[PDB]
Amino acid sequence: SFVEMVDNLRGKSGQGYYVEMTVGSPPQTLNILVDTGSSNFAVGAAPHPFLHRYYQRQLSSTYRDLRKGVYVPYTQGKWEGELGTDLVSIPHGPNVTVRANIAAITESDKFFINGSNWEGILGLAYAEIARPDDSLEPFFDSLVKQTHVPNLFSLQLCGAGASVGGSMIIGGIDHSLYTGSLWYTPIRREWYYEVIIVRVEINGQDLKMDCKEYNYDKSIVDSGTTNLRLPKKVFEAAVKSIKAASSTEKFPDGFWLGEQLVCWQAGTTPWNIFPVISLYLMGEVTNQSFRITILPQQYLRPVEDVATSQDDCYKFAISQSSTGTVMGAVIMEGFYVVFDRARKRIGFAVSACHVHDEFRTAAVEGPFVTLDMEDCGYN
Numbered sequence: 001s002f003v004e005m006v007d008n009l010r011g012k013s014g015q016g017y018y019v020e021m022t023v024g025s026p027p028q029t030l031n032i033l034v035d036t037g038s039s040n041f042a043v044g045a046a047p048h049p050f051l052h053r054y055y056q057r058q059l060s061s062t063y064r065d066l067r068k069g070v071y072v073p074y075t076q077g078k079w080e081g082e083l084g085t086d087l088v089s090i091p092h093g094p095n096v097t098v099r100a101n102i103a104a105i106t107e108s109d110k111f112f113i114n115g116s117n118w119e120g121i122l123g124l125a126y127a128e129i130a131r132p133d134d135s136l137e138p139f140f141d142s143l144v145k146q147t148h149v150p151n152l153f154s155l156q157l158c159g160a161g162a163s164v165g166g167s168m169i170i171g172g173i174d175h176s177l178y179t180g181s182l183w184y185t186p187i188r189r190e191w192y193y194e195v196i197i198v199r200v201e202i203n204g205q206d207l208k209m210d211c212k213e214y215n216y217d218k219s220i221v222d223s224g225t226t227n228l229r230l231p232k233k234v235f236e237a238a239v240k241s242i243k244a245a246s247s248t249e250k251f252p253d254g255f256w257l258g259e260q261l262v263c264w265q266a267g268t269t270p271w272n273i274f275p276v277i278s279l280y281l282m283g284e285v286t287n288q289s290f291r292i293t294i295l296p297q298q299y300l301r302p303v304e305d306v307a308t309s310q311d312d313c314y315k316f317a318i319s320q321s322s323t324g325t326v327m328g329a330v331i332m333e334g335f336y337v338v339f340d341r342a343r344k345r346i347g348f349a350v351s352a353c354h355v356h357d358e359f360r361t362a363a364v365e366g367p368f369v370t371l372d373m374e375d376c377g378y379n
Ligand SMILES: CCCCNC(=O)[C@H](C)C[C@H](O)[C@@H]1C[C@H](C)CCCCCN(CC)C(=O)c2cc(OCC)cc(c2)C(=O)N1
Pocket: 014, 015, 016, 017, 033, 035, 036, 037, 038, 039, 072, 073, 074, 075, 076, 077, 111, 121, 129, 130, 131, 222, 223, 224, 225, 226, 227
């Protein structure tokens, strides 16, 4: 019984997906970015030039100070604040209210985004990576412990159609939101949502790297990062192959770094020259894997043309990483992703809001046979 949570996510392209939440008594409404890459629930609690509203602890009668400070650094951005607890609910989520830890953000650096329409972050990953330490219970843990909500959620992130939308199904799977079968990959370790990539193909050709390189030093599923982020060695190989496949057209080197945009006359984007990327994930049974296939419509993110919006302009949404693979929003978009915490696995299926290429199609396909998959995890 999940129809009430369908379409409960909003956002702007490249600025994250948010869900509406309320904090305190009486309830204060805030838009909260959904981040499977972290584990702290934090909200702006002091004025900031990019915040249209913030959490006012003095107006909540159920607020409780924990008299302990907190700091969270991310790959990009950081904030510091004061810890406390309060009553939290999700208007378009389960009909429950829980007491959860809340970090009241008092100072921040490159965290809030001008005009994003969100004021806080909901870290949905595990306690192991919560700050200041893993004794700070994350929100979803509190939700499961205090109510009957099952220990899982799913994310259906939909692309354009600059507005963006989607669904966060709290406590289950909504079968009307995907087609075909769900394919599951083990959660390697409960800290980030860590997975193991066992093979990479571009336009059907194996990159033929040591599969440890794909997971160096980890691979995570992260709704709070836009791009697909790849370790240096993998990024270089992927860009070389993508450049070769599209070499009939000229792009500035700044394009391949995410610095400059590429444009084409409206409706003439040469999709056919950009390859499909297949990520093979470790499966549920011995020597078995499955693949998810990414179309160029996912890793060429449309950007609104600031000048004369007569052209279709895009940014390369694959970037280099020094902290492992990050399967960001552009990978998740077009798939229905099940964070099955109870069974320690992540499921993928083709989304009902999938990308529409005229001759190619995003897919989740299996089974494949893959020997020695555990050797692909980095130690
Ligand atoms: C300390 C405990 C664990 C911390 N976890 C992490 O740091 C994760 C690995 C990352 C988080 O998901 C982390 C979450 C992030 C703050 C949410 C608010 C800002 C979203 C910005 N945005 C729009 C959607 C991006 O696209 C983007 C771009 C980035 O690089 C640009 C060069 C980095 C990150 C995000 C990023 O850092 N996103």
